[PDB]
Amino acid sequence: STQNGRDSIGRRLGIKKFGGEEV
Amino acid sequence: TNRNARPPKKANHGARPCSSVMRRLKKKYFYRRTKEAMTPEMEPKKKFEL
Amino acid sequence: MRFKNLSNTKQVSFKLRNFKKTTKYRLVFGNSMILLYKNARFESIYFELFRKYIKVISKKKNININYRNCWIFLRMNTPLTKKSKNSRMGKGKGALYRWLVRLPKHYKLLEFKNVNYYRLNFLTKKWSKRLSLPLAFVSKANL
RNA sequence: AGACAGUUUGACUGGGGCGGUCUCCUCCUAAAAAGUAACGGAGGAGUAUAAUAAUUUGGGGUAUCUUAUUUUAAUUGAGAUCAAUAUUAGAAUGAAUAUACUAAAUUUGAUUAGAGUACAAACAAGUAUUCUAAGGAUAUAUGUCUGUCAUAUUGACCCGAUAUAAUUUAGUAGAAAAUAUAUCGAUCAACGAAUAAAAGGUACGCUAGGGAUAACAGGCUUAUGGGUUUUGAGAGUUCUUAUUAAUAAACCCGUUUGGCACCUCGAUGUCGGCUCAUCACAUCCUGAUGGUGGACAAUCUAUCAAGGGUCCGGCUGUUCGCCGGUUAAAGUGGUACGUGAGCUGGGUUUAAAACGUCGUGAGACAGUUUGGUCCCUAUCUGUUGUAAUUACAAGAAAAUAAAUAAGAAUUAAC
RNA sequence: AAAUAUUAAACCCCAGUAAACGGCGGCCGUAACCCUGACGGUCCUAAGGUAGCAAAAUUCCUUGGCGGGUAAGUUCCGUCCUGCAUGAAUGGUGUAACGACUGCUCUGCUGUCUCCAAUACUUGCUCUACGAAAUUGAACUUUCCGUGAAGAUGCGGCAAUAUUA
RNA sequence: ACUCUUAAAUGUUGCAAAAUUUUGGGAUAAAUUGUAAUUAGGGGUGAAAGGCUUAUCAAACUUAGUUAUAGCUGGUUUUCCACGAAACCUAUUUAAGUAGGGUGUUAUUUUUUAUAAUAAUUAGGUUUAAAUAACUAUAUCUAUAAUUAAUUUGUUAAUUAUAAAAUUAGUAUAUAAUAAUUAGUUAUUAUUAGAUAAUAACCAGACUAUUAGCGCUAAGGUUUAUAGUCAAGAGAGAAACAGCUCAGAUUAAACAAUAAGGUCUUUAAAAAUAAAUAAUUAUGGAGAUUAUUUUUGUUAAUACUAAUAAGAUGUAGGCUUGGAAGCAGCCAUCAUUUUAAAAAAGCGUAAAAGCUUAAUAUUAGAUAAAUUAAUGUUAAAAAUUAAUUGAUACUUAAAUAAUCAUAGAUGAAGAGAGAAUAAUUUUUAUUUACCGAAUUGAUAAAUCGAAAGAUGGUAGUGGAACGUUUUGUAUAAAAAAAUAAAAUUGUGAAAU
Ligand SMILES: [Mg+2]
Ligand SMILES: [Mg+2]
Ligand SMILES: [Mg+2]
Ligand SMILES: [Mg+2]
Ligand SMILES: [Mg+2]
Ligand SMILES: [Mg+2]
Ligand SMILES: [Mg+2]
Ligand SMILES: [Mg+2]
Ligand SMILES: [Mg+2]
Ligand SMILES: [Mg+2]
Ligand SMILES: [Mg+2]
Ligand SMILES: [Mg+2]
Ligand SMILES: [Mg+2]
Ligand SMILES: [Mg+2]
Ligand SMILES: [Mg+2]
Ligand SMILES: [Mg+2]
Ligand SMILES: [Mg+2]
Ligand SMILES: [Mg+2]
Ligand SMILES: [Mg+2]
Ligand SMILES: [Mg+2]
Ligand SMILES: [Mg+2]
Ligand SMILES: [Mg+2]
Ligand SMILES: [Mg+2]
Ligand SMILES: [Mg+2]
Ligand SMILES: [Mg+2]
Ligand SMILES: [Mg+2]
Ligand SMILES: [Mg+2]
Ligand SMILES: [Mg+2]
Ligand SMILES: [Mg+2]
Ligand SMILES: [Mg+2]
Ligand SMILES: [Mg+2]
Ligand SMILES: [Mg+2]
Ligand SMILES: [Mg+2]
Ligand SMILES: [Mg+2]
Ligand SMILES: [Mg+2]
Ligand SMILES: [Mg+2]
Ligand SMILES: [Mg+2]
Ligand SMILES: [Mg+2]
Ligand SMILES: [Mg+2]
Ligand SMILES: [Mg+2]
Ligand SMILES: [Mg+2]
Ligand SMILES: [Mg+2]
Ligand SMILES: [Mg+2]
Ligand SMILES: [Mg+2]
Ligand SMILES: [Mg+2]
Ligand SMILES: [Mg+2]
Ligand SMILES: [Mg+2]
Ligand SMILES: [Mg+2]
Ligand SMILES: [Mg+2]
Ligand SMILES: [Mg+2]
Ligand SMILES: [Mg+2]
Ligand SMILES: [Mg+2]
Ligand SMILES: [Mg+2]
Ligand SMILES: [Mg+2]
Ligand SMILES: [Mg+2]
Ligand SMILES: [Mg+2]
Ligand SMILES: [Mg+2]
Ligand SMILES: [Mg+2]
Ligand SMILES: [Mg+2]
Ligand SMILES: [Mg+2]
Ligand SMILES: [Mg+2]
Ligand SMILES: [Mg+2]
Ligand SMILES: [Mg+2]
Ligand SMILES: [Mg+2]
Ligand SMILES: [Mg+2]
Ligand SMILES: [Mg+2]
Ligand SMILES: [Mg+2]
Ligand SMILES: [Mg+2]
Ligand SMILES: [Mg+2]
Ligand SMILES: [Mg+2]
Ligand SMILES: [Mg+2]
Ligand SMILES: [Mg+2]
Ligand SMILES: [Mg+2]
Ligand SMILES: [Mg+2]
Ligand SMILES: [Mg+2]
Ligand SMILES: [Mg+2]
Ligand SMILES: [Mg+2]
Ligand SMILES: [Mg+2]
Ligand SMILES: [Mg+2]
Ligand SMILES: [Mg+2]
Ligand SMILES: [Mg+2]
Ligand SMILES: [Mg+2]
Ligand SMILES: [Mg+2]
Ligand SMILES: [Mg+2]
Ligand SMILES: [Mg+2]
Ligand SMILES: [Mg+2]
Ligand SMILES: [Mg+2]
Ligand SMILES: [Mg+2]
Ligand SMILES: [Mg+2]
Ligand SMILES: [Mg+2]
Ligand SMILES: [Mg+2]
Ligand SMILES: [Mg+2]
Ligand SMILES: [Mg+2]
Ligand SMILES: [Mg+2]
Ligand SMILES: [Mg+2]
Ligand SMILES: [Mg+2]
Ligand SMILES: [Mg+2]
Ligand SMILES: [Mg+2]
Ligand SMILES: [Mg+2]
Ligand SMILES: [Mg+2]
Ligand SMILES: [Mg+2]
Ligand SMILES: [Mg+2]
Ligand SMILES: [Mg+2]
Ligand SMILES: [Mg+2]
Ligand SMILES: [Mg+2]
Ligand SMILES: [Mg+2]
Ligand SMILES: [Mg+2]
Ligand SMILES: [Mg+2]
Ligand SMILES: [Mg+2]
Ligand SMILES: [Mg+2]
Ligand SMILES: [Mg+2]
Ligand SMILES: [Mg+2]
Ligand SMILES: [Mg+2]
Ligand SMILES: [Mg+2]
Ligand SMILES: [Mg+2]
Secondary structure (H helix, E strand, O other): OOOOOOOOOOOOOOOOOOOOOOO | OOHHHOOOOOOOOOOOOOOOOHHHHOOOOOOOOOOOOOOOOOOOOOOOOO | OOOOOOOOOOOOOOOOOOOOOOOOOOOOOOOEEEEEOOOEEEOOHHHHOOOHHHHHHHOOOOOOOOOOOOEOOOOOOEOOEEOOOOOOOOOOOOEEOOOEEEEOOOOEEEEEOOOOHHHHHHHHHHHHHHHOOOEEEEOOOOO
């Protein structure tokens, strides 16, 4: 018997535009 | 038969395609195989002092 | 594991399938010391067998010393769970039967202050033969 | 009125079932971008709130410790200290310190409409917010505000419903009705939701498939198991090693209990017994020898050793096991736990029937009891025996050696 | 168009029905010794397993304990009672006679067995006439160990065989 | 007799699609049996077993709806040329199915939003760490301010708390800070594709190397990540081997140089120069024996070896004890005689006695050898510091090499077999060379391509052709069929 599991999905976080790029 | 324990020779550069030999033997400098029949000791708050 | 609530909480820790660490040994408190020379799971009975034989050395009748002889820093770190006999895999993790200490390579098991050089060499050799581990003895003299 | 009928009676899963789970959030796993599974480890959510919200204003910076004070502190004064603690609605992480906490004045931006990019992303869905217009609050505003520090705090479409910023053609005009803007109703929780509407038994059983998937057996593993070896707590008059041996340790074997699920699911197999065997040695007796707390005898222990040998009988379905009696001894095991195309079929796994127990009921049982059907002409290998044809040396009739292999009964009273 | 009033069988409530189904308790303490518990209280229930039988076709622990029989008996007979999960028309207890029924025992008898031998016919083997069957990738078809889709006549490695019936 | 069929053997492609032989039950009765007839498919009939109903019964037989349906198994027929996947994600009464993305092919287009390599560059918070904020545990220091007992209370003795200062170990869910590589963007070079459209297959994966989670950090185990190979891929080496190494095959054909590997014979190919081992030589364990080499130092010429001798005394130390006399045990470790000799490092005793080592003498044999650095020349009946290497013994100890460290069950079974003592052979180190693939270069041809060069291939897409049937061309021309063999041509199906 196991009550565990039930993790969530990863969330797409972080930097999307790095230094020197165009904006 | 026991393709697991067929040790690789020179031309087989340290690996066969179904061997589980070389992966065992790397563990005898940081792993030792324990036992059941020891003394039961269950107190994580044990004092090793004399 | 989690050191917060040891007795209350139920504890589990991952077995570490390849864990290796080296910590540069050096004496701090005293003169001579014993140090481990291999990554290993140090039990408790590895200590309690040769616990009296250290007291017979460091402590003696009718003699008083102000300062301190031995410095120990051992604590338990690994629960070492296990399954029953007729149990299939899956359906969770095993249960406890012991506790241990996962020590690194260069670990000061003991640190001594003015203790008989001649006996500790006689001890640590017998220590290491029961355990079959490589152990060392060091003194400020030889260094 | 199951009297009769037509149908449903989820899935995942380390066989299946019983049990548990099924959507959403946070960390570890996760390996310095993001993502990353498992019946892996842990905790949480199905809300709250018209002020806990919006704009201004004031206050001590908070927190830890010590101390003094018209003994008092809205939140007193002074001093030192704090790899950012105190807290920030609730789980966890992350972050902030112009945070947060506290006092107060005005107030409803927790408003309406229209255009568009970016992240993310099968799809659909979800997210942050600038720009333009109307109409407001705050109040130097010069400016700020399109719910709460953040992330979860839920549900498609259909059908239907209340209020309404708009339109209408089943001949025409209206009613009716449909659609449109705003909005409400589900543990449809199996949470992408197949229906408004759904449980079981089959030992009377059928068909299609699978070694994608189980029980015996093989194979890998060897926690467990058995044995060797090193150490030697404690007994042995003293005394660790005549004998004995806890504990701890280094290897081996593949006979037990098990884990996995690689071969076989397109005619077969389960324990035991009769007959028949063969192998190992980790040897029960016989044979040799060392040691002895060995006077002799009897015995204990260890080594070398596989030549030959190793019981009948009562109860049980029985290996085993207890018992009676004996013997030089009544060995441990492998060979599909040897041997069913060589015999038996008693046990156990079909149909009949009965008791007990559970169950509304069909019926069920790692409970019991009586009964109870699979067959075979041997092509090849292999083997026990028997001959034929042919070859060799000139041809032929007879007698022998040599060489290799196979075989050989053990015990011992008296 | 909607609403109220009037009302049948049926359903609920109520009553009855137990050779219908079904069901049948516990706690506390008590008598020249613990234990035992006639009794006395205690709580509850619709009522508390009464008679009788009982290791049974019903017993998990179980080859239960004692006795009988046997040189020795897990079965059998008799007997005791924690009846795990006995029990009165799903009938309880007992019972002379009957049974191709199940279990145990005795005498006699005997190739069932110790221990197997000899004989007759049939079958079989040889010649002759006739002449099937399932089956079958091909085939010039060897042992051992190793190997490997994990137990090899066929691959590898040292070897065997004059050829066939 | 008749009727039924308990028990055993036989038989089982039988005499027989349920019998033969022996035995056995009932046999005036709920009996047996003939003739003809009735009862009919969820109904019949049933002294009830789920039995019987023309060898068929948990619902007959025949025809028909009907070519029942099948996400399932089994199968899908001639040739050549090119390109070439997937076994992952997300949903699913879904898990052996299907759908979209992703990967494949073809076509089109004044077509790069692309791949690889090098370099610059940005964030990060695994890792690092004599780091320590947190949790669990933890060793020390101290100004200052105080205490307790006692008549040695104008002294003696023992103690406590504390600002500042301040150590150490550990961890899945601990880090202020901080790596490489990966990843994003830009540039450069080089390759040659990219975008859109039309559209198929796949969605059971396996192993190895690195890395983690469950597991005896056991399993050819199970689930993720990053590469590679099988899958879809031959050849050479691994004794034999889908997954390891080398390598990536258009076809042909008696040229050469090479890749991992290997050179005593089998087995194609080499020897030389120095050294290790002596074990029926590979092949490994805690650990033991032997040998060798190297090493530490509060050691020492009375070195060391052998032979003989001695190894004492105050003292039976004090105490305790049934006893304790050097040696049960407690405190003490003094001193003397000796050339030297422990209130003893041990054996021994009921306690005594007695034995041996440490320390040591006589005699003989016998090791003590090589060096570096300083104040120019004046002290002396005289005296030289710091320091190394090496021979021997004691001592610290480690390393290397060989040997042993029990073995299973059809038969050496390990090590491919046999052999070999390093002389052409095991092992180690330098040196010079060779054999060795379908690789590469050279020669011939075919197809795409200006040319350089490209051409392995499953599911799967596209292109180019052979053969067969029928009709017309044919109001024309005439035996061209079939069967077998040989020859000839074609890349080939095939044709003549
Ligand atoms: Mg998960
Ligand atoms: Mg997460
Ligand atoms: Mg029904
Ligand atoms: Mg109904
Ligand atoms: Mg239907
Ligand atoms: Mg299922
Ligand atoms: Mg299961
Ligand atoms: Mg990451
Ligand atoms: Mg890591
Ligand atoms: Mg995945
Ligand atoms: Mg929950
Ligand atoms: Mg707030
Ligand atoms: Mg403010
Ligand atoms: Mg202050
Ligand atoms: Mg919040
Ligand atoms: Mg919080
Ligand atoms: Mg709103
Ligand atoms: Mg994007
Ligand atoms: Mg969308
Ligand atoms: Mg939101
Ligand atoms: Mg706001
Ligand atoms: Mg709907
Ligand atoms: Mg009309
Ligand atoms: Mg109208
Ligand atoms: Mg629904
Ligand atoms: Mg669903
Ligand atoms: Mg769903
Ligand atoms: Mg979703
Ligand atoms: Mg039945
Ligand atoms: Mg079937
Ligand atoms: Mg098995
Ligand atoms: Mg093994
Ligand atoms: Mg074990
Ligand atoms: Mg003793
Ligand atoms: Mg002892
Ligand atoms: Mg399988
Ligand atoms: Mg098999
Ligand atoms: Mg089948
Ligand atoms: Mg078959
Ligand atoms: Mg032996
Ligand atoms: Mg024998
Ligand atoms: Mg003999
Ligand atoms: Mg008898
Ligand atoms: Mg019997
Ligand atoms: Mg006996
Ligand atoms: Mg079998
Ligand atoms: Mg068997
Ligand atoms: Mg057989
Ligand atoms: Mg009942
Ligand atoms: Mg019978
Ligand atoms: Mg034959
Ligand atoms: Mg054969
Ligand atoms: Mg009743
Ligand atoms: Mg009674
Ligand atoms: Mg009994
Ligand atoms: Mg008895
Ligand atoms: Mg009885
Ligand atoms: Mg009852
Ligand atoms: Mg009853
Ligand atoms: Mg009654
Ligand atoms: Mg009855
Ligand atoms: Mg009756
Ligand atoms: Mg009766
Ligand atoms: Mg009677
Ligand atoms: Mg009868
Ligand atoms: Mg009985
Ligand atoms: Mg005889
Ligand atoms: Mg042959
Ligand atoms: Mg084999
Ligand atoms: Mg081959
Ligand atoms: Mg062969
Ligand atoms: Mg008769
Ligand atoms: Mg009769
Ligand atoms: Mg009669
Ligand atoms: Mg029945
Ligand atoms: Mg019939
Ligand atoms: Mg039917
Ligand atoms: Mg139709
Ligand atoms: Mg259907
Ligand atoms: Mg290609
Ligand atoms: Mg893949
Ligand atoms: Mg669904
Ligand atoms: Mg399917
Ligand atoms: Mg698609
Ligand atoms: Mg595509
Ligand atoms: Mg950080
Ligand atoms: Mg530090
Ligand atoms: Mg540390
Ligand atoms: Mg970490
Ligand atoms: Mg699928
Ligand atoms: Mg898959
Ligand atoms: Mg995979
Ligand atoms: Mg899988
Ligand atoms: Mg593995
Ligand atoms: Mg696997
Ligand atoms: Mg698998
Ligand atoms: Mg290949
Ligand atoms: Mg090959
Ligand atoms: Mg390659
Ligand atoms: Mg080529
Ligand atoms: Mg060459
Ligand atoms: Mg040669
Ligand atoms: Mg060793
Ligand atoms: Mg002497
Ligand atoms: Mg004396
Ligand atoms: Mg005295
Ligand atoms: Mg004395
Ligand atoms: Mg002594
Ligand atoms: Mg004495
Ligand atoms: Mg003396
Ligand atoms: Mg030489
Ligand atoms: Mg040589
Ligand atoms: Mg060429
Ligand atoms: Mg190619
Ligand atoms: Mg091709």
